[PDB]
């Protein structure tokens, strides 16, 4: 179906920000951009 | 292969066109303006050729 790729152009150019997670945008490969990682440490088998 | 050969093979003006966005612009034509040499290599598919 001809308009296959055309449907992805809006997907790759989508910059929807006001979301439940907030600021989700696909990169060139489509992976998630601008995530958050919480650095975690072990303290006597207990985690902080 | 070019480096380990006594024949003086040389390469220049290596081109790369982006057929991903398909904006329809002349980025292909603008890039190919700076071209010379009588031998040009192509590597594409029949439908897009």
Swiss-Prot record, chain A:
Post-translational modification: NMDA is probably regulated by C-terminal phosphorylation of an isoform of GRIN1 by PKC. Its phosphorylated state is influenced by the formation of the NMDAR-PPP2CB complex and the NMDAR channel activity.
Superkingdom of the organism of origin: Eukaryota
Residues that carry a glycan: 36
Disease tied to this protein: Neurodevelopmental disorder with or without hyperkinetic movements and seizures, autosomal dominant: An autosomal dominant neurodevelopmental disorder characterized by severe intellectual disability and developmental delay, absent speech, muscular hypotonia, dyskinesia, and hyperkinetic movements. Cortical blindness, cerebral atrophy, and seizures are present in some patients. Neurodevelopmental disorder with or without hyperkinetic movements and seizures, autosomal recessive: An autosomal recessive neurodevelopmental disorder characterized by severe intellectual disability and psychomotor developmental delay, involuntary and stereotypic movements, spasticity, and inability to walk without support. Intractable seizures manifest in some patients.
Function of the protein: Component of N-methyl-D-aspartate (NMDA) receptors (NMDARs) that function as heterotetrameric, ligand-gated cation channels with high calcium permeability and voltage-dependent block by Mg(2+). NMDARs participate in synaptic plasticity for learning and memory formation by contributing to the long-term potentiation (LTP). Channel activation requires binding of the neurotransmitter L-glutamate to the GluN2 subunit, glycine or D-serine binding to the GluN1 subunit, plus membrane depolarization to eliminate channel inhibition by Mg(2+).
Subunit structure of this chain's protein: Heterotetramer; the NMDAR subunits are modular and harbor tiered domains that function in concert to regulate opening and closing of the cation-selective ion channel pore. Forms heterotetrameric channels composed of two GluN1/zeta subunits (GRIN1), and two identical GluN2/epsilon subunits (GRIN2A, GRIN2B, GRIN2C or GRIN2D) or GluN3 subunits (GRIN3A or GRIN3B) (in vitro). Can also form heterotetrameric channels that contain at least two GluN1 subunits and at least two different GluN2 subunits (or a combination of one GluN2 and one GluN3 subunits) (in vitro).
Name of the featured protein: Glutamate receptor ionotropic, NMDA 1
Organism: Homo sapiens (Human)
Lineage summary: Eukaryota, Metazoa, Chordata, Craniata, Vertebrata
Gene coding for it: GRIN1
Residues of the whole record sequence present: 315 to 362 of 938
Curated annotation (Swiss-Prot), chain B:
Tissue/organ expression: Primarily found in the fronto-parieto-temporal cortex and hippocampus pyramidal cells, lower expression in the basal ganglia.
Post-translational modification: Phosphorylated on tyrosine residues.
Subcellular location, record wording: Cell membrane; Postsynaptic cell membrane; Cell projection, Dendrite; Late endosome
Family label: Belongs to the glutamate-gated ion channel (TC 1.A.10.1) family. NR2B/GRIN2B subfamily.
Subunit structure, interactors included: Heterotetramer. Forms heterotetrameric channels composed of two GluN1/zeta subunits (GRIN1), and two identical GluN2/epsilon subunits (GRIN2A, GRIN2B, GRIN2C or GRIN2D) or GluN3 subunits (GRIN3A or GRIN3B) (in vitro). Can also form heterotetrameric channels that contain at least two GluN1 subunits and at least two different GluN2 subunits (or a combination of one GluN2 and one GluN3 subunits) (in vitro). In vivo, the subunit composition may depend on the expression levels of the different subunits. Found in a complex with GRIN1 and GRIN3B. Found in a complex with GRIN1, GRIN3A and PPP2CB.
Disease: Intellectual developmental disorder, autosomal dominant 6, with or without seizures: A disorder characterized by significantly below average general intellectual functioning associated with impairments in adaptive behavior and manifested during the developmental period. MRD6 additional features may include seizures, hypotonia, abnormal movements, such as dystonia, and autistic features. Developmental and epileptic encephalopathy 27: A form of epileptic encephalopathy, a heterogeneous group of severe early-onset epilepsies characterized by refractory seizures, neurodevelopmental impairment, and poor prognosis. Development is normal prior to seizure onset, after which cognitive and motor delays become apparent.
Domain description: The extracellular N-terminal domain (NTD) endows NMDARs with a unique capacity for allosteric modulation, harboring several binding sites for small molecule ligands that act as subunit-specific allosteric modulators of ion channel activity. A hydrophobic region that gives rise to the prediction of a transmembrane span does not cross the membrane, but is part of a discontinuously helical region that dips into the membrane and is probably part of the pore and of the selectivity filter.
The protein's name in its UniProt record: Glutamate receptor ionotropic, NMDA 2B
Native source organism of the sequence: Homo sapiens
Lineage, top ranks: Eukaryota, Metazoa, Chordata, Craniata, Vertebrata
Gene name of this polypeptide: GRIN2B
């Amino acid at each position: 179906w001809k308009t296959g790729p055309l449907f992805k152009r809006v997907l790759m150019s989508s910059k929807y920000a006001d979301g439940v997670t907030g600021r989700v945008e696909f990169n060139e490969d489509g992976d998630r951009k601008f995530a958050n990682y919480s650095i975690m440490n072990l303290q006597n088998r207990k985690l902080v | 292969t070019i480096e380990n050969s006594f024949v003086g093979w040389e390469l220049e003006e290596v081109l790369l066109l982006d057929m991903s966005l398909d904006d329809g612009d002349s980025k292909i034509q603008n890039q190919l303006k700076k071209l010379q040499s009588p031998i040009i290599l192509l590597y594409c598919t029949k439908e897009e050729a």
